[PDB]
Design a protein around this motif. Structure first.
Motif, PDB file in Angstrom:
ATOM      1  N   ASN A 119       0.823  -1.206   0.000  1.00  0.00           N
ATOM      2  CA  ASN A 119       0.000   0.000   0.000  1.00  0.00           C
ATOM      3  C   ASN A 119       0.860   1.258   0.000  1.00  0.00           C
ATOM      4  N   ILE A 120       1.943   1.263   0.780  1.00  0.00           N
ATOM      5  CA  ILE A 120       2.797   2.445   0.861  1.00  0.00           C
ATOM      6  C   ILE A 120       3.521   2.676  -0.461  1.00  0.00           C
ATOM      7  N   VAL A 121       4.130   1.629  -1.013  1.00  0.00           N
ATOM      8  CA  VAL A 121       4.899   1.721  -2.249  1.00  0.00           C
ATOM      9  C   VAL A 121       4.292   0.760  -3.260  1.00  0.00           C
ATOM     10  N   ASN A 122       3.843   1.298  -4.392  1.00  0.00           N
ATOM     11  CA  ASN A 122       3.253   0.505  -5.464  1.00  0.00           C
ATOM     12  C   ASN A 122       4.150   0.381  -6.684  1.00  0.00           C
ATOM     13  N   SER A 123       4.879   1.435  -7.035  1.00  0.00           N
ATOM     14  CA  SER A 123       5.768   1.404  -8.191  1.00  0.00           C
ATOM     15  C   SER A 123       7.065   2.153  -7.904  1.00  0.00           C
TER      16      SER A 123
END
Lengths: 147, 48
Positions: free
Chosen positions: A21-25
């Protein structure tokens, strides 16, 4: 141990989801309607609202499990109402360590320290080391051929 | 006396923060629709 493994796995999954959720890409009406309709009670219905316990013990003599039912509302054997139930532990690790200390399975040919430790840990095992009431080997089913 | 010297520093810090957030994260939990929605009226309300 299984509960600890499950909670560790769930924590790992939760942290993985957070990183991604925090980092997607509630059955009162159902009980009322059942009482109104059936208008009859059996002992095998009050325990249905709580989880049960099954302890099967099958054998090759006959294909039929030995189902065991334990009460959930009492602190009996197998019940889970307040916490960790009876596990029957702390009575095998010491024996295994004593047996593996000298690589001898028979405790009769062990060291004096091992015998003293076994006596101290197991009060009921002190009556075998003194060699009281002699009997040939250990054959509980002696009545048949004795008679 | 007034505080009108750190505007450029604040702007560059905000730009660096935004670019690093774009490079590493993907917004998500950061509210991006509410700020745009409030600014849509702030732009025509505060300047006039």
């Amino acid at each position: 141990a299984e509960t600890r493994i499950q909670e560790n796995n769930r924590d790992v999954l939760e942290l993985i989801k957070r990183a991604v959720n925090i980092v997607n890409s509630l059955m009162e009406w159902f009980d009322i309607c059942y009482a109104q309709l059936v208008s009859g009670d059996t002992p095998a219905d009050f325990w249905k609202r709580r989880p049960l316990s099954i302890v099967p013990r099958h054998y090759a003599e006959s294909p039929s499990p030995l189902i065991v039912v334990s009460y959930n509302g009492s602190s009996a054997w197998g019940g889970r109402i307040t916490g960790s139930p009876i596990l029957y532990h702390s009575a095998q690790a010491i024996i295994d360590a004593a047996c593996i200390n000298a690589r001898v399975d028979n405790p009769q040919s062990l060291h004096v320290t091992a015998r003293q430790e076994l006596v101290a840990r197991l009060p009921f095992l002190a009556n075998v080391l003194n060699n009281q009431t002699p009997l040939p080997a250990f054959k509980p089913g002696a009545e048949m051929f004795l008679n | 006396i007034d505080i009108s010297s750190g505007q450029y520093q604040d702007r560059l810090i905000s730009l660096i923060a935004l670019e690093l957030e774009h490079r590493r994260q993907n917004v998500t939990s950061l509210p991006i629709a509410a700020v745009v929605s409030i600014h849509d009226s702030v732009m025509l309300q505060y300047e006039r």
